[PDB]
Amino acid sequence: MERIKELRDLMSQSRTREILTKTTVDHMAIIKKYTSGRQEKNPALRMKWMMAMKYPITADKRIMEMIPERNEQRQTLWSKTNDAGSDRVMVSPLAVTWWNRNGPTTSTVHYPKVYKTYFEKVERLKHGTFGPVHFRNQVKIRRRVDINPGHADLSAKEAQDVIMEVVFPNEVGARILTSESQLTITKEKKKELQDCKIAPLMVAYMLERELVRKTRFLPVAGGTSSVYIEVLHLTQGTCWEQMYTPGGAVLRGFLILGKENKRYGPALSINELSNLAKGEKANVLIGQGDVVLVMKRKRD
Amino acid sequence: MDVNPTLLFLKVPVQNAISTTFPYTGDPPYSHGTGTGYTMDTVNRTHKYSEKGKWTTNTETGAPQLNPIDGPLPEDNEPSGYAQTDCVLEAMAFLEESHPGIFENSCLETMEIVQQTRVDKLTQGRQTYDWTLNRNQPAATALANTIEVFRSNGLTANESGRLIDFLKDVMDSMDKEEMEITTHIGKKKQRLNKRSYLIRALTLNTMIATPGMQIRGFVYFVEALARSICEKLEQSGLPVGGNEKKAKLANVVRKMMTNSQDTELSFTITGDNTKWNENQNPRMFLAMITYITRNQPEWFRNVLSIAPIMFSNKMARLGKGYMFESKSMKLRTQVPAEMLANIDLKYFNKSTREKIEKIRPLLIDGTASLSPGMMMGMFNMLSTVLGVSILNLGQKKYTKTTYWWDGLQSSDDFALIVNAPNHEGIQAGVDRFYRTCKLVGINMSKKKSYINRTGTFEFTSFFYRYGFVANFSMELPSFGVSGINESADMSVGVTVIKNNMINNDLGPATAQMALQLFIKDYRYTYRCHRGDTQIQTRRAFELGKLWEQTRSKAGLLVSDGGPNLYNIRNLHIPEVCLKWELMDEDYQGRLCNPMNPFVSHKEIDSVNNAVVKSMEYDAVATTHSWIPKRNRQRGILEDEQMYQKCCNLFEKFFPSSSYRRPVGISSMVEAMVSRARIDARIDFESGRIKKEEFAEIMKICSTIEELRRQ
Amino acid sequence: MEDFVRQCFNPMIVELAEKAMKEYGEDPKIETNKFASICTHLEVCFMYSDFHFIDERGESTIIKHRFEIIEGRDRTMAWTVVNSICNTTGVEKPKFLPDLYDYKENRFIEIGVTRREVHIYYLEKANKIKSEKTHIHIFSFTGEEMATKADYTLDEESRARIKTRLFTIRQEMASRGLWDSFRQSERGEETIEERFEITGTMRRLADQSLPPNFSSLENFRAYVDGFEPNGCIEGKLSQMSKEVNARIEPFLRTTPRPLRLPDGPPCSQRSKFLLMDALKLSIEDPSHEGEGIPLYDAIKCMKTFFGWKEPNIIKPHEKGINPNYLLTWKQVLAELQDIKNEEKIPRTKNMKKTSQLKWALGENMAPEKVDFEDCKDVNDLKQYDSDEPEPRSLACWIQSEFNKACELTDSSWVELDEIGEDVAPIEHIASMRRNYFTAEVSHCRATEYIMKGVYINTALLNASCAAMDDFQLIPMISKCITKEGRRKTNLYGFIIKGRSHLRNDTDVVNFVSMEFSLTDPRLEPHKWEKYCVLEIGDMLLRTAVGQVSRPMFLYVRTNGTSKIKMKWGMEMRRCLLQSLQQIESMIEAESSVKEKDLTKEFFENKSETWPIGESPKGVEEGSIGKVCRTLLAKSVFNSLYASPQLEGFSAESRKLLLIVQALRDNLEPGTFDLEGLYEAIEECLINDPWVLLNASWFNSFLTHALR
Ligand SMILES: [Mg+2]
């Protein structure tokens, strides 16, 4: 496969081989920050300049299999070129509009589920009620208020735990596999997002947004509840107050028995640990690539 | 009748109509005011303001160094740098006395920060002077180049992943006899002796100036300590935001006025410090850091003291050089500053002649030695700590007289308030504050400061008038397209308008006008004019076809030629969700198709977040979430993308690395090989990979393991 | 680190570690690595001993504790218990303190938790402590383990629990960024405090960075450590001379003086296009074939005018070649006629490179670059001229320009986009306020300037990107809505753009602008020093006496624009926002005072007035609409005439304005170096007409406010 061949190619050269063999999985993130690029100063002017070009957008390789080269008016949608560093072909906004008006249609059923917070915002605004405006001196006291309503008030650590369990089931670390009980929210989200083609990174980001608690230091002149903070712009002002009412298997219990033991067979994956027996000891790749010998928790 | 807008102040008070006194709304299109002559002028002025100090020659760099500390006390009102060590130590002592335990808690918090920090933090800075390339480079590139050179010189402590280990490597390198630099052109080797390397590591490239990678970590730790100190002071205007500054101004004014008796007299000084950097001495910072870190582990004291020690022997590069033009033959040539030391003085004007004559003795290897003074944007929080100490020295239990002062200090700016029984009391208090500032090395700009009865003043462009505070530190922010993409730009624009309405006193009608102008700019920039309009654009045909095809035109996004449904009501709602109920089924499916070739997500830090400061915007990943095209020599790294090339191909093995920072004991290659083997086995077992492919993959894995072992 | 240790370990274990480390007088808050090491060791001890018992037959049963703890007690108690075990069971006395006593095997077992490799730790322990009849079990955070003779006392289950606990602790430490220090802090058998020493070069540098009367950084540290405040500040204050003071000089009514404007020849026009002298050829309804594209509209607009005659120079450019400009205009006319007779008008017209156009656009007109050593001996070589710019006196043409910019035009110049339907009552209030402001501002001449600049700069940027190396012809076009509501397209002139190989955001593209006008330059030649003006035609103007002929001139000049300047021009619509913000702030202040919405009482009043102008009679007052238009024109002229002088003058004169305001409030204002402030304000007035006009406005305001 392209991935393993590219790994071999990287390991061929001396410096890349040394960095791969030396840096541990812990320090990977560190070397992720050694970017050789350059952020564009004043990206607004850069965008204004680009949009006057012919092909300022970067699609991927597969676009050429679906979007035709030219439309009815013979305007070229994408060009047989490449970006500066990858095989991302050059395309034009005409291609985006062509996809939006003629591209394949799918079923957007998971979008309300994944973006639940935004649609909850919409529903709260839709069912709200409005009162008269009162003009007078405004004295807003500044205090810490919550930002996102409907959250589970989950700790960032535990929110990340749930996100890893749901989005990336077969990359959970030793802590998850060694735990005794599974949170109900995790199972509910796993059932809710079974067949979800949305990018797993987007799903993880939305889950973290919807499960973590966030607070900000804001002035307030009326209610302090979270539902009253999202509409702070609409309700309170410098010299006016607007009266608004808002409208709203079990892969756990495993003990590590040391490092990889080749006598016990090839390393498995987490997702297939359910097929083990009551006391069978196997080799599993946990975390981001750590092979360990594991056994089921017999004699709880 | 001759129109005169200034006459509007005859009725509207200036503070109420202060907006009319600001000429621009956004960055002006010249961005000028810097150059080599400017750097030489700053060096000359800094040395002049302390010329009565003691001269010495550095035993390592052999550079003239001026020490005005404990110098003769000033005899005039001109700027001076003759700060007294005892006076500053006493100011720190009284600051601790008024706030017992502040220094100890701040030191403990900074120790926690130091132990848990990481090297990649240094990649978060601005353009920095790479000594390996001897020019300005990006922070990440400079860090990578320095690490590569250190590794080539047998310095690898930074491989532990901690910034403090990188600092240990930096010190060891400062103790290296020779340094080798290899540039890949093919290959090329250069050798630097101890003195040359020290000079390079003790430079500040001028372009205001920027330090090299050898001082970024120490400065970072010192500023962390200063931030911890400042967070516990109510008289410090740093690093709070715009919402926490109005509260402080109002509180201080109320404290100094309402507490005043019926016979007490209160006055307020709006004050700028004339230089505040060319008179701040690194020795004073070292003294006050030594006092702050009393009774601390020796390693912590040493780490915190390295920064002022390093800055006390800093060097300043003189820039590009000079431009010479001839009239007879219309000939132009560039003279680098390096030769400026060994050139005659018949091509430069009188003022430039004086500048070069003054700066010649201070230069070594093209860099002027600048021991005294400082540069803005480097030790802002330590200077704020010193200013707040002076402010706190105004309590009635320290003045021992009827008059007493209090106020706010924000790095360079300050607002003072003096209460005394009578006018002579106010004058005495002002004189005492000024003289104490002079003793500690702080100069008040008499021309940029003024006093008046308490009730009206200004502080960091916040104008206070009888309780009404107008915030103009930053005026109307940009109300156009940020330049990320269509969805991100729409979300950012609406969110920015909403935030300005919430915080920056933006009115409803002004918000509506801002929304209208932003929508106009968005449509013109992205050519997404309303489908029914007859404006001719390269994107007009597709948008018109989409408009005619659709049934519910209200559901089309603005980027798709739809109408604008935004108002003050729904600035907090993403556009995709705002008109989700109005979208046609097929159009909704096409727009929200996860398999489209346009959507793309980078690491989570860059997901739904844009760097301007960083602001998070709410958006739905759609077809409009594309990426603009990328746009783009001596080099230490043969392959400048090696780090990215390695980090990439790890997300294809462990996708969670994109969302979470990975943790593991094994090396990257070993983990990747294990995952490859497991995936190949599972796929071959499932029956969607054949014997040939499986064996082929097993064969590459074996040779990769052999390569790693070898 | 300490927080993680406290929140991870069992509180009793934390207390045991705290007491054990206090026994040695060590501070956990200052040495957290040792604290974590002791906590891990004690937890491993407990888990080793936990969940074990001895049955009635002496066998080991998992439910007398099988293991007796020895490391969880004081030295005295540990020694007493180990001696009791040795006496009761007759076991050899261990040389060093053991950790656990095994009843089933009747021996002493010691456990070592190693951050490094297990074999190294085992070898060190064997060569250090192990003497005789002592078992060693070495555990690691990576899951490994080792023991003597590979005889592990516990069952696989308990060892699995210990390994899992250690692995989890390792993972949590790594994720929190504490594992690096924790692993680096182990040296053989002990945990060492962090070390960061100053030596060698850095030590000498530190010794060279002290006050004058110090030689060693250690001496300075010792002095600071024992320093106690003893009236040092008071003594130094009593010593310094009294000439160092901040004396407040009163500022009452006579201290301020008029700002001194620079003396010299009058200032000239530097804007990118004509403002009040602009003449536009207009088509009242663009309903022609291929309409909308600039070139066809420009051709149609030109066709509407009859009376073109042979061009000739009227006002030559003193520093320029007038025949080149004349030939450029002739070439533009010839190309327009050629495309007109072609009947195949293309979207964009690229001009043919010509000597006149090559010179006018500054194509290749630049000194050649050479090395200094190659031309060091040239007699005429000198540093680039950067002297003091020549001061210029204020002229009345800029005031007339501003007066014109503030008055209404007969037709509307803004067609802002739409927004969602208003629902909240505050939304209705905002809509009413915005509509009032728009009605006051829609027909202003400043709006015309805004649209003109926006269109010109948008066209220039698009042409520069599209045609990098072509001499494009760009008509200067604007759109308008007359009183009758009919769309009208106006053409002001043409711009020929040169090479646009722009890579940075500051490199300049040079263009030639030729603009129609009716004003004779000879009336105010000083205003047109940068322009070459030719008489290009004749026009008929209507008046009470019929039609009168007036010459029609063409102002031709060469200019340059960068990407940043083009973006600045395209973003001119924010002047509307600025003016609206000020006008709305006034209304909101009044409403807060009166506790009710006063939009009607501000805009429909037409009786309340604000001082907005000066006449020979005195100060003049205008309605709210006049104030809106005046502020919009001020913003527009600030945008058009931006310069460092303008921002400097604004920043410096804000202080003087606030001092005067404090005076007007009877707040007893006072200054320290008011002459310095005056010098700072006046240093920013050299030649810019806009800054000089602003200075004159400030002088007039001072005169009127002081009285
Ligand atoms: Mg100030």
Side-chain angles (χ1 to χ4, degrees), chain B residues 270-272 413-414 448 458-460, chain C residues 655:
Chain B
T270 298
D272 252 331
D413 250 65
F414 75 96
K448 285 200 242 59
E458 180 255 336
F459 177 79
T460 63
Chain C
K655 287 141 187 314

Side-chain angles (χ1 to χ4, degrees), chain C residues 70-125:
Chain C
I70 318 293
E71 202 70 283
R73 297 200 208 80
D74 292 341
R75 290 187 253 154
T76 333
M77 318 300 172
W79 274 125
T80 308
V81 297
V82 73
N83 288 331
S84 118
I85 297 319
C86 106
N87 284 334
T88 305
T89 39
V91 197
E92 72 93 9
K93 268 218 190 187
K95 294 180 180 178
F96 289 105
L97 278 83
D99 262 32
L100 298 186
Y101 162 58
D102 186 304
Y103 274 95
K104 139 71 162 164
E105 300 294 338
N106 308 284
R107 47 190 204 213
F108 294 119
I109 69 183
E110 166 98 47
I111 36 161
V113 170
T114 164
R115 271 63 71 72
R116 317 162 308 169
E117 267 73 52
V118 291
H119 45 109
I120 292 279
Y121 199 89
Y122 190 74
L123 263 54
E124 256 79 353
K125 207 114 177 122

Side-chain angles (χ1 to χ4, degrees), chain B residues 400-419:
Chain B
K400 322 278 204 38
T401 36
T402 62
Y403 60 85
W404 59 294
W405 66 76
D406 189 350
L408 304 134
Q409 179 95 37
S410 159
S411 69
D412 174 32
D413 250 65
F414 75 96
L416 196 75
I417 315 187
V418 193
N419 291 24

